[PDB]
Write a protein that binds this ligand. Structure first.
Ligand SMILES: COc1cc2c(cc1OC)CN(CCc1ccc(NC(=O)c3cc(OC)c(OC)cc3NC(=O)c3cnc4ccccc4c3)cc1)CC2
Ligand SMILES: CCCCCCCCCCCC(=O)OC[C@H](COP(=O)(O)OCC[N+](C)(C)C)OC(=O)CCCCCCCCCCC
Ligand SMILES: CCCCCCCCCCCC(=O)OC[C@H](COP(=O)(O)OCC[N+](C)(C)C)OC(=O)CCCCCCCCCCC
Ligand SMILES: Nc1ncnc2c1ncn2[C@@H]1O[C@H](COP(=O)(O)OP(=O)(O)OP(=O)(O)O)[C@@H](O)[C@H]1O
Ligand SMILES: Nc1ncnc2c1ncn2[C@@H]1O[C@H](COP(=O)(O)OP(=O)(O)OP(=O)(O)O)[C@@H](O)[C@H]1O
Ligand SMILES: CC(C)CCC[C@@H](C)[C@H]1CC[C@H]2[C@@H]3CC=C4C[C@@H](O)CC[C@]4(C)[C@H]3CC[C@]12C
Ligand SMILES: CC(C)CCC[C@@H](C)[C@H]1CC[C@H]2[C@@H]3CC=C4C[C@@H](O)CC[C@]4(C)[C@H]3CC[C@]12C
Ligand SMILES: CC(C)CCC[C@@H](C)[C@H]1CC[C@H]2[C@@H]3CC=C4C[C@@H](O)CC[C@]4(C)[C@H]3CC[C@]12C
Ligand SMILES: CC(C)CCC[C@@H](C)[C@H]1CC[C@H]2[C@@H]3CC=C4C[C@@H](O)CC[C@]4(C)[C@H]3CC[C@]12C
Lengths: 571, 571
């Protein structure tokens, strides 16, 4: 079995540094161990310290498994269940468990075997009725909080861990369900596994199951030792129960100073260090003194989950495609029959500008989903599911690449022929390629800004402002040849400028807009004159210059996003 | 005291109609009464039925207070505490209680007296340490879930009600805090008040406090009667406890079929109807067979809370003002020194278009706050705080009117003189007025769309799409004189068109853009020619036509919003 231990633990958090956890010493031998305490005592913090999910800076003690230091496979042979559930709402119960099994259990096992394990877990936790139902989504009403909580427990159990950490496994659950969960852990603990969990308001039947007990309060350790002997320890100092049927209440009332015999917290702790229990553990403590699956598998499974999540959030995929089609048709109707007249220049420039800005501003919606999933990404990376690289490339090849390509194609196919733009194939494909490139560049910039930011509103605001400032330098609202020199350099940071310039160069090159024709100066009859007055070049190199600039921006921004994820605080 | 009662209650929910609650009969005499049951049994639904927060369509029974039917002041002399807390995060604890006191307690009392009551409540609930701290916000980490829960309890207690309904008052609270809350209610119930609440996992000490008991399960009523006699009733059918220290577990285990003696639910219910308890209540039941404060006060307090909420969410007020200033300065730099040259027309039209669209699209951010507060509005209206009209006008005079006016002023003051637009005062004030009008019209349209919609994403998408379609008809991207007749009529539904046309008419009227000057046809030297080619009229009536159209749209859209709130399902 696994014999966890700790000694002289203290933790500090920040300027001013405060100690959430003061001196703590204990041994969590195999079996079933518990951590009772009042709210704010530090139950969740100690658990993370034991499971190495806290920044090692603050930690000021030694944690040992079976005497030897922490192995590098610790997170490959342990499980952690979070106080606040992190479960992808858009998926069903079974799908989430499948995801955990696939990326944590080794690939040597057959997929049928894994599904058999998954079914067994579901039956044990009583999730059969909602096995294939969806977890809650904003659009889709889903399972209750209790079923969601048990689902998080399931994902960790599937790994068949030798060590399991749980935080408030029984919250939002009625007594019957709570008892079933605890009995399962007890059965799971009579085989050599070590189970550590924090609980609120146990029943007497449950409390008898506890083998080892830990009692936190305001950081201090009031009592650690066998659960059955806890009553005797308190009785010696005073506090003869003889009132409460449930002992768990008897402990908490003492801590809150509601029972008969400087602060009561410090006073009680001083008693423990003088107890035999502290002496025994000090004697024992002093005496004692990688990823399962490869890159490709992680990529496939992450991309799959992203596909499903995207389809489950309609506003970002289905709605964008539908509005794309509607806009294409309306534009085709509004600009139908472009004429080489006085009005041709205006309408052509306007439509191209509209398409460009539409591609740029549509990227905001997708990345917002990248923002909301920061918490899940951190939790899964810490738990040891996947690497950063796999998550990044999967989200790209599932969300950014497929969906952002289509709007360009739809817009070109619908608009080009209805309006009557350049009737040559080269122009058609150039238009499609250019729109694709601006879309990808905007998405990459959005990712660079949004990656690592927790709040959706702030990221949305920042990206919107940046796109606005780009749009001012697109080449239509202002003439770039009239801008002062000390500000003109900014026009090279604008994506819409490159796309818009390319489209203009493609459309205006061989057109005359004065129908019947002593040249009339101050008049732009020919398209080339308009291009010149707007600053654009006439060589073939201008178009391709814009395109290569877009590609370089894509690469730069995506790389920045990867680095922002890499140097993030995953603790 | 207050003697509530019910008889033959059944409720139906929807097509297919299902009965959440089957036959239910009971009397909730003064004192302390409880509703235990497993999750999903129907505890929250019955409570709403008793407190008249459910649609009366489904209800199929009679509810009586003191024998007489439900008075119209029922919600003026009752309190309801929600299972999921509804507390404005951006405010402190004390501020929320002040809001409840001001609008529910009569104005005859002095404000100092109310604050004295508020202090007493806080001391009783143990919220003194966090009395003036802020409740949780996304930006501001706030009080724990337990303190938030007790705060919701406080707001109802301040009214000093003769009848109080609570739903899971002890959830997220440790035993010590839970016991304190229950003891307070017990003390509050020995004076004539009637208290009804639903609870999970009581302690034996608490359960002895219960005077009357109700036991729901899968809709059916398994037991109603005195709490002390509940054990005897079950013992007669079998189920001699002699195992469990806490009786509350003994009841729930039976319902879940985990104890010794068609489904167990139906089987148990059949026993109750044959019990003496059912006979007694049937004998008794068969035997038995406005706003405190005026309009202005509600308006003032709603507007005040809205001010605070707006300031607490920086992204909507502070950020919008800052970006407004930054955009003004950047625009002033980009377009500095507008010249009566070939480029003057383009830059002028572009800047005016940018300002107009900025005013239109900035309205999305504010209304989103109107969306998120739908739940709170429904809860408060049902509880009897305020009317619909007061809420509407308060949110207007607090959020829409003050904040949307400033950006226009800032933009005009910064931009007008730096660029060098028409150097006459009339044009300056016309520009300011026009921008104000488009801002208000867009906000009104946003409210009309967003009011009554629960999801933020959908409303944001809809308003954004509508503004896009308006923007196509602004007069720049397309020439309105070239649009086909069967679609041209749409141009009269566009707000940016009216604002943009007014600004163009103000700026271009007396300008010549050909510097040195056989007239050169196909050339727009004079501004009037440009206006004509864009379809605009030259009379003074065009400008004012646009303005009056905006005003009419404002009135229409705001009225629609009020009606949408009025005919909403507040149940
Ligand atoms: C988790 O819950 C959620 C929370 C939230 C959201 C979604 C959620 O759920 C996931 C999304 N919330 C977005 C709120 C929002 C959206 C937009 C703006 N503001 C502009 O967009 C704009 C501003 C200008 O000045 C400030 C401006 O100046 C000129 C031109 C602007 N836009 C254009 O010009 C333009 C042009 N073509 C377009 C074509 C297609 C689509 C958009 C186009 C836009 C401001 C706020 C924020 C919170
Ligand atoms: C002027 C009109 C045309 C030019 C428009 C300029 C847009 C520039 C877009 C590329 C910048 C970029 O993408 O920056 C990318 C950076 C990269 O993160 P980081 O630097 O490593 O931050 C450190 C992060 N750590 C500490 C975790 C490592 O993200 C950010 O900084 C986030 C905020 C960006 C705000 C940008 C607002 C720009 C307003 C400009 C007002 C004049
Ligand atoms: C074409 C370019 C220029 C013209 C642009 C047209 C914009 C019209 C704006 C005013 C309409 C309005 O504000 O409608 C206001 C209505 C009012 O609610 P209700 O009718 O009572 O719904 C019943 C609600 N109950 C049942 C509770 C009473 O809100 C809505 O319907 C909500 C959805 C509106 C979607 C509008 C999308 C428009 C897309 C047009 C694609 C051609
Ligand atoms: N990163 C952090 N920054 C600042 N304070 C923290 C941080 N982490 C924990 N704390 C503080 O430590 C104290 C204990 O928080 P903790 O998360 O341990 O609560 P808990 O013991 O899990 O109780 P419960 O989860 O039941 O509320 C709190 O006062 C909290 O503010
Ligand atoms: N509007 C509704 N539409 C469909 N079903 C409903 C509706 N309201 C309630 N129900 C159903 O009634 C049953 C009881 O739900 P209820 O809200 O009463 O739970 P509860 O008794 O409050 O239990 P808890 O709140 O502890 O989960 C549930 O199965 C729920 O799906
Ligand atoms: C039908 C046409 C004319 C409507 C104009 C386009 C806009 C207003 C429509 C087109 C497609 C629509 C979306 C279609 C599907 C969904 C998924 C649903 O679960 C919520 C609403 C939502 C997100 C719709 C919102 C409104 C929407 C974006
Ligand atoms: C991290 C971010 C800010 C990186 C920004 C890099 C951008 C500004 C770089 C990437 C590639 C660059 C372009 C590469 C090629 C050319 C062609 C040349 O004849 C003019 C400059 C121009 C058009 C460059 C302008 C600056 C440019 C677009
Ligand atoms: C300083 C200038 C150049 C920045 C450009 C303007 C944008 C990027 C800045 C200007 C004002 C800024 C806001 C100022 C204050 C707040 C409140 C804070 O609790 C969260 C960030 C937030 C919401 C900022 C977000 C970024 C913001 C909107
Ligand atoms: C509920 C919503 C859709 C109501 C929409 C009403 C709009 C379209 C109405 C309100 C006031 C109306 C305007 C009132 C006055 C004039 C001046 C006239 O010489 C031309 C029509 C014009 C410009 C009207 C166009 C239509 C108009 C703008």
């Amino acid at each position: 079995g696994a014999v966890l231990s700790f000694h002289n633990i203290c933790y500090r958090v920040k300027p001013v540094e405060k100690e959430i956890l003061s001196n703590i010493n204990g041994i969590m031998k195999p079996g079933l161990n518990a951590i009772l305490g009042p709210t704010g005592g530090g139950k969740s913090s100690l658990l993370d310290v034991l499971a190495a999910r806290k920044d090692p800076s603050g930690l000021s003690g030694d944690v040992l498994i079976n005497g030897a230091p922490r192995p590098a496979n610790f997170k490959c042979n342990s499980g952690y269940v979070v106080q606040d559930d992190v479960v992808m709402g858009t998926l069903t119960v079974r799908e989430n468990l499948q995801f955990s099994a696939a990326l944590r259990l080794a690939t040597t096992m057959t997929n049928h075997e894994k599904n058999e394990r998954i079914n067994r877990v579901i039956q044990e936790l009583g999730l059969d009725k909602v096995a294939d139902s969806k977890v809650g989504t904003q659009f889709i009403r889903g399972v209750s909080g209790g079923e969601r909580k048990r689902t998080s427990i399931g994902m960790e159990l599937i790994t068949d861990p030798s060590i399991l950490f749980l935080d408030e496994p029984t919250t939002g659950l009625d007594s019957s369900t709570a008892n079933a969960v605890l009995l399962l852990l007890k059965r799971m603990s009579k085989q050599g596994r070590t189970i550590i969990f924090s609980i609120h308001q146990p029943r007497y039947s449950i409390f008898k199951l506890f083998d080892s007990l830990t009692l936190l309060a305001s950081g201090r350790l009031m009592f650690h030792g066998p659960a059955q002997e806890a009553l005797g320890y308190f009785e010696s100092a005073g506090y003869h129960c003889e009132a409460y049927n449930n002992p768990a209440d008897f402990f908490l009332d003492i801590i809150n100073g509601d029972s008969t015999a400087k602060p009561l917290i410090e006073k009680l702790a001083e008693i423990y260090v003088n107890s035999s229990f502290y002496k025994e553990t000090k004697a024992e403590l002093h005496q004692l003194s990688s990823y399962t699956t490869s890159f490709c598998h992680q990529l496939r499974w992450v991309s799959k989950r992203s596909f499903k999540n995207l389809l489950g959030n309609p506003q970002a995929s289905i709605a964008q495609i539908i509005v794309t089609v509607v806009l294409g048709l309306v534009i085709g109707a509004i600009y139908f029959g472009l004429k080489n007249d006085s009005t041709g220049i205006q309408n052509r420039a306007g439509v191209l500008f509209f398409l460009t800005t539409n591609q740029c501003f549509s990227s905001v919606s997708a990345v917002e989903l990248f923002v909301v999933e920061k918490k899940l990404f951190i939790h899964e990376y810490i738990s040891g599911y996947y690497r950063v690289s796999s998550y990044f490339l999967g989200k790209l090849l599932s969300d950014l690449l497929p969906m952002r390509m289509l709007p360009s194609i739809i817009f070109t196919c619908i608009v080009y022929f209805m309006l009557g733009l350049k009737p040559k194939a080269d122009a058609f494909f150039v238009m499609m390629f250019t729109l694709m490139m601006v879309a990808y560049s905007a998405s990459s910039m959005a990712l660079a800004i949004a990656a690592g930011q927790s709040v959706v509103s702030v990221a949305t605001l920042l990206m919107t402002i940046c796109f606005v400032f780009m749009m001012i330098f697109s080449g239509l609202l202002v003439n770039l040849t009239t801008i002062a020199s000390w500000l003109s350099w900014l026009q090279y940071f604008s994506i819409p400028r490159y796309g818009f310039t390319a489209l203009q160069h493609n459309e205006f090159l061989g057109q005359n807009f004065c129908p019947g024709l002593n040249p009339c100066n101050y008049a732009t009859c020919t398209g080339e004159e308009y291009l010149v007055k707007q600053g654009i070049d006439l060589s073939p190199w201008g178009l391709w210059k814009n395109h290569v600039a877009l590609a370089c921006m894509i690469v730069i921004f995506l790389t920045i996003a990867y680095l922002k994820l890499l140097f993030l605080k995953k603790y």
